[PDB]
Ligand binder design. Structure first.
Ligand SMILES: Cc1cn([C@H]2C[C@H](O)[C@@H](COP(=O)(O)OP(=O)(O)OP(=O)(O)O)O2)c(=O)[nH]c1=O
Ligand SMILES: Cc1cn([C@H]2C[C@H](O)[C@@H](COP(=O)(O)OP(=O)(O)OP(=O)(O)O)O2)c(=O)[nH]c1=O
Ligand SMILES: Cc1cn([C@H]2C[C@H](O)[C@@H](COP(=O)(O)OP(=O)(O)OP(=O)(O)O)O2)c(=O)[nH]c1=O
Ligand SMILES: Cc1cn([C@H]2C[C@H](O)[C@@H](COP(=O)(O)OP(=O)(O)OP(=O)(O)O)O2)c(=O)[nH]c1=O
Ligand SMILES: Cc1cn([C@H]2C[C@H](O)[C@@H](COP(=O)(O)OP(=O)(O)OP(=O)(O)O)O2)c(=O)[nH]c1=O
Ligand SMILES: Cc1cn([C@H]2C[C@H](O)[C@@H](COP(=O)(O)OP(=O)(O)OP(=O)(O)O)O2)c(=O)[nH]c1=O
Ligand SMILES: Cc1cn([C@H]2C[C@H](O)[C@@H](COP(=O)(O)OP(=O)(O)OP(=O)(O)O)O2)c(=O)[nH]c1=O
Ligand SMILES: Cc1cn([C@H]2C[C@H](O)[C@@H](COP(=O)(O)OP(=O)(O)OP(=O)(O)O)O2)c(=O)[nH]c1=O
Lengths: 289, 289, 289, 289
């Protein structure tokens, strides 16, 4: 079963970014030339995933709904569900249980930006996996802040620890995950962690203890950025800016990926571009077709 | 009469930043570690202006309201009014006619960021002017995009042109203006320009024609940035970031300015800083007191 | 024959960066934490090319020499030759005629920075080509500034134009080229272009006309930057900085690449890293081993 | 006696920037669009100082000499003297003793960038002081790395400590200093510090113990940047870039300051611009006149 459903966890508190995130959701913040949520959404789209459930806070869910709509304009089927309280990323599978049904589902954090040659290829391997789960390991400078994966001599993943005091490696689990349908039952039975939250890491550990976790390496050639701090938020923006300025191509443009993957055709693009042709984004879409 | 009233024009369509401004108000977009509106707000605070009316769109006006409230926490008196449609910047004085009354009133654009040694001294001079109006002239690289002020050989402001195809100089009129009570009567009788908008420049031309306009020069030693383009918004953030990182001091932090100007006491600061201590912002205010 | 020889063209007038290039060679300018030449040098190292000739101006050639020496510390064999005057990039093969001999030879511009997942795999394919030549096509925002490659409806490279007034496409030819021995004979018989310079593009057109040119596409997933302008040089540095900061890994560090490719052992690394431990650079290599 | 002599200490080791500073002096590195040394030189020029002694290493002194010449082109009188070994900034007065004679002299570190409205004014006060010394205090985030100044209740400087473990404040002494002629005798008798170097800080302490030190406050409105680390070097570049891009005015352009201060007239500017008009710097100079 190809993973055809996905979830974007665009809620949270964003205390690290106050007061910036006091009146503006972290996932609505701009990462250079477009709202942050366009990045994780693009990643799902590039995986061939069109049916997406967007989860956010009670106050912000309607805003992402106003920004994205039902997604038909990009040939997508977007749905929205509120997460009452930020009680853990794993809760996404409890909230989106109905949305998932008996199918497989991907989950990507709303503030995660993925960029790199052959990124679609790497995900497709996970999209096609008949069962189990697929997570990605990425070398970072401060692994303690993330879910760290320990590898043995042969280079095989053996354990996972959420924000360990002493990381057993510098490889963090990224915020993009692909699960089979058994994820829902795991989430429903998960107990609050040591930090009072239902962590996705605990789900990844269950898949691993059952020998069903594939820890796909995401090399240094790829870019995996986070936007939880003032510093990182601006670093990611400069990053994307350098790339787009040089290439004359936008990174993660929903309209462009929709067109290139045939979710919509040229006429639709032209119709969308027209009313926006007055600005650069519109001109970008027109040049594309 | 010392100017004690100010108006922050925080609306507009903001079509140039599309799509970042599709889900979040431009004046709420972050400039490194704080909402864009904190900057022009700080400018008025530094000018001694505490009674401030915030005008935004019908959709966003309530958002600024939820973010800032009546402003009493910073020893300010904030009021809010909606601008049905972006009919023009000069329309701010018609909308705020009741708020202004018979008093003098300053106007600052919600996306204007001012910074430089003696800035307070600069505004102070314009704030104490008995009558007339005061605008500032800043040397910019792209004059065509703003109100341009031409000078005669003696170096005296002789004319003002809104977005001239052939700028008569590289000095633009910034978005910080100090007017006397007569400004209300002018805006009320203003006729829409060729572009169907009530131009603030027209107001300024009227003051000039009446020999009541002081065009204060704002030297290159000062920094004046607006966020018209994605590229400019990110440079604005890098600018503020380098400064703050280096000095270990924040730029345009309302809580700090309210405190250093004795608008509020150390106890009020500690209370407002409590929820914001998850990051440097709140810890900063704590150390400040 | 596996391409084992490479030439790094590190000269030129560099008049566009004036005055930064008035006292220091452009290829010695820093890109965040290391000299610009370390990047193209790393590209050749990653392509398996260890015998490298560095061509620069009569003034700078000796400077690269003092910086890198014979390159044996990185398990390389570096040679140096002077380019009297910047008569053209294709002149590299006349100057390096003795160095090349009867072998194949790669050419990379001293100011070219390549980065991306599978980059080594990309070059590997061109390095193992029996005969012919291999260049790469990259989508850029300003094609007019480089050799442009046009494609027919079937998507096949049909022509090459040096700095066309009317680019036939947005794909530029990067400064990394893989040629067979016949390149020497071509450059020797090349006549200066309209701008009085021996164009590398002419060489490439000759390979195309002989049906021996492979135009490999270099996707948007890859990053290709040159330092033609002050603005580009700084974006290049921010790009590398964000990446290194995030991964806790360095981009194009010769010592590291020489080590991971077994060009040198851990003992050689420790020795070269000793003097460089006053900053992250040397400490990095230490932790690496 | 108006301070009419100055010294630029453009030597040092720059170990923190290896290998960037292995073949390129730190003061030759680019700070966006021009070599680092243009900044401290500009500061001296803005102080009305034309007779300047440039001190550097034995290998780099001739390079600054090749970049600047005798300075007659900018209406200056530049001299050069080598500092055999980086034995301390205070040694600058031993090396330049002959250059100083019986006159007053300013000293600015070669990697110090000063920017801010009314910066010339602040220096002129020090330039006119009949005797004693003038140093500047600046609020920084990491004072331990600099010479820290302690102030009492009234806000009067009382002590100075070079790189104290526990700074008595967050105010660092900048790298710009103005001394009367007694500085030479102090330097000749200075004993190596606790770190085996003749520190300028010890000279500042002697002036203070004699009640002849003026610690001029340099507020947050000013920008004082250092370029000793990879991070700071790029932060300063982005800073200057944002300013120049917005204003269309260059920060610290020797040719421009020379013209504006009448060291040279328009004809000279035109003659200098002509041969450089092909690049942006030349066009900048032409637009200026
Ligand atoms: C936990 C948790 C996170 N998030 C999503 C939001 C984020 O994009 C992503 C990770 O952000 P996180 O930074 O780990 O949580 P946060 O957004 O509240 O930031 P802070 O720690 O400063 O308070 O996960 C939720 O939507 N719901 C949750 O219950
Ligand atoms: C290995 C290695 C690669 N590179 C750069 C070259 C390429 O542009 C980019 C990616 O090439 P690759 O390394 O092969 O891509 P990767 O994602 O597989 O990296 P890894 O599995 O080792 O984490 O990394 C270096 O600069 N230094 C190195 O030591
Ligand atoms: C016109 C107009 C502008 N603005 C404020 C919004 C901005 O902060 C400030 C800047 O002037 P403008 O730049 O013209 O504001 P804008 O958003 O209309 O420009 P654009 O759509 O091209 O991006 O003026 C209003 O609030 N109301 C108005 O009627
Ligand atoms: C004039 C002039 C100033 N400066 C920098 C030095 C100071 O840090 C900063 C401000 O000092 P001043 O220039 O004298 O202050 P200003 O902003 O009033 O100058 P102006 O009226 O010409 O706009 O400008 C230059 O770099 N080049 C110049 O040609
Ligand atoms: C032409 C020519 C270029 N170059 C190398 C230098 C650069 O790294 C690379 C880039 O191509 P160019 O950009 O044309 O090099 P350039 O320095 O002549 O360009 P400009 O003066 O406008 O800044 O080519 C030479 O070494 N020798 C040459 O004869
Ligand atoms: C195509 C396409 C890719 N991507 C980003 C996603 C990946 O991180 C990165 C590279 O994945 P891929 O695009 O599939 O690798 P590529 O460089 O070969 O693509 P192309 O041949 O079209 O140049 O590009 C977009 O954001 N938008 C797009 O329209
Ligand atoms: C000490 C000392 C510094 N310097 C000048 C060079 C610098 O611009 C300035 C301060 O730089 P410093 O950073 O304090 O010394 P440095 O340039 O050797 O850098 P590092 O500590 O990483 O080795 O003083 C000298 O020229 N001679 C000296 O004897
Ligand atoms: C004080 C104070 C100033 N400012 C900004 C406003 C001005 O653009 C800039 C400089 O105004 P001024 O503060 O008066 O300039 P200054 O160099 O004298 O600062 P100080 O003596 O306090 O160190 O600082 C703030 O943002 N917050 C503050 O709390």
């Amino acid at each position: 079963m190809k993973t055809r459903k996905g979830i974007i966890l665009a809620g949270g508190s964003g205390t690290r970014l106050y007061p910036v995130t006091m009146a503006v959701s972290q996932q609505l913040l701009p990462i250079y030339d477009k709202p942050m949520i366009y990045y994780p959404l693009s990643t799902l789209m590039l995986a061939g995933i069109r049916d997406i459930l967007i989860i956010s806070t009670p106050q912000d869910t309607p805003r992402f709904q106003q920004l994205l709509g039902d997604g038909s304009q990009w040939g997508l089927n977007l749905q929205y569900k509120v997460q009452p309280s930020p009680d853990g990323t794993a809760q996404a599978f409890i909230i989106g249980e109905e949305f998932i049904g008996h199918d497989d589902c991907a989950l990507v954090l709303g503030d995660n930006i993925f960029y790199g040659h052959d990124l679609p290829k790497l995900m497709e391997a996970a999209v096609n996996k008949e069962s189990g789960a697929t997570v990605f390991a990425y070398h970072v400078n401060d692994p303690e802040r993330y879910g760290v994966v320990e590898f043995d001599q042969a280079g095989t993943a053996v354990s996972l620890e959420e924000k360990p005091l002493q990381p057993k490696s510098n490889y963090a689990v990224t915020g993009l995950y692909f699960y089979d349908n058994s994820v829902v039952e795991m989430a429903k039975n998960l107990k609050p962690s040591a930090r009072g939250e239902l962590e996705i890491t605990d789900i990844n550990r269950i898949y691993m203890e059952q020998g069903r976790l594939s820890v796909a390496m995401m090399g240094r050639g790829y870019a995996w950025l986070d936007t939880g701090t003032h510093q990182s938020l601006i670093e990611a923006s400069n990053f994307i800016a350098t790339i787009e300025e040089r290439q004359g191509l936008k990174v993660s443009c929903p309209e462009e990926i929709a067109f290139r993957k045939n979710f919509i055709n040229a006429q639709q693009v032209i119709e969308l571009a027209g009313p926006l042709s007055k600005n650069d984004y519109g001109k970008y879409l027109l040049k594309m077709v």
